[PDB]
């Protein structure tokens, strides 16, 4: 840090000492210049990383501005959900059967989505209700008594 930020003073010190030593050999120094002054690859990378961190700290100020908008978005979404819950809970409290029906419909929808999908799907053969002698054949009807 001193070498870089005091380049002129380092050059003047070098010039003084070099003048004193070159006088003994009857040489005159007209100018001394530190034309190049660089460091190792690792140190340069570390300095660049430090300044990158400074820029990242400055970038973090816009994350606060984005956080304000995110706060507003969260509140708006929650207001919608609160209204929806208010009206739907009273309906479902008497009998949640709609959910079940909705679930069935969901399954159907999903099946369509899954028909043309790129996924590999391994389903249970119980979906085909082909084992008529199974003990669980009467479960659905038995639940209706």
């Amino acid at each position: 840090s001193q070498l870089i930020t005091q380049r002129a003073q380092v050059s003047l010190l070098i010039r003084r000492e070099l003048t004193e030593r070159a006088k003994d050999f009857s040489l005159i120094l007209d100018d001394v210049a530190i034309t190049e002054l660089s460091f190792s690859r690792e140190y340069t990378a570390a300095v660049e990383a430090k300044q990158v961190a400074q820029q990242e700290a400055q970038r973090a100020q816009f994350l606060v501005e984005k956080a304000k908008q995110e706060q507003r978005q969260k509140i708006v979404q929650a207001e919608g959900e609160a209204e929806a819950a208010k009206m739907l809970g009273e309906a479902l409290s008497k009998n949640p059967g709609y959910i079940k029906l909705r679930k069935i419909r969901a399954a159907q929808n999903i099946s369509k989505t899954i028909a043309t999908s790129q996924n590999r799907i391994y389903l249970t053969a119980d979906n085909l209700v082909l084992n008529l002698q199974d003990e669980s054949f009467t479960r659905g009807s038995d639940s209706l008594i």
């Binding site: 990242e56 979404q77 929806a84 009206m87 029906l101 389903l123 119980d126």
Partner: protein, 144 residues
């Protein structure tokens, strides 16, 4: 080749990147002062000292661009919030539909029972088996 170089490198070390760019005139004036003083001793005189180009490292420039991109994304968040307000309206309307449907079905099933649910399960089993029949990527395995 010496004086200029040293003088320039000696002055740039007085400022950071922000000062180097936003106070380019002051940096140039200080370089001019130092260079004029040093070159007067060699019998030279400067008619103009200019800092024509000034850039930084790859990583630092990437960081600066990321900072400004973050500013633009903060600006985009406002339109995301507007979309959210419209989504709230749509969600409330759809939820009113869902709640009316739930009320109807609850009134029916409170006295009727869940026979319709079992019948719908069987019909949906048939329909879902049909939907998946054309897919080679679907395999059926026995329970267990």
């Amino acid at each position: 080749p010496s004086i200029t170089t040293e003088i320039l490198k000696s002055v740039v070390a007085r400022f950071d990147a922000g000062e180097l760019i936003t106070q380019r005139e002051l940096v140039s004036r200080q370089v001019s002062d130092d260079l004029t003083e040093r070159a007067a001793t060699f019998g030279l005189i400067l008619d103009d000292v200019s800092l024509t180009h000034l850039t930084f490292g790859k990583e630092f420039t990437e960081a600066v661009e990321a900072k400004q991109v973050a500013q633009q994304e903060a600006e985009r968040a406002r339109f995301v919030v507007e979309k959210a307000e419209q989504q709230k309206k749509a969600a409330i309307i759809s939820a009113e539909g869902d709640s009316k449907a739930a009320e109807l079905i609850a009134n029916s099933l409170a006295t009727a029972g869940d026979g319709l649910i079992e019948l719908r399960k069987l019909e949906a089993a048939e329909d879902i088996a049909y939907q998946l029949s054309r897919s080679r990527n679907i395999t059926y395995l026995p329970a267990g």
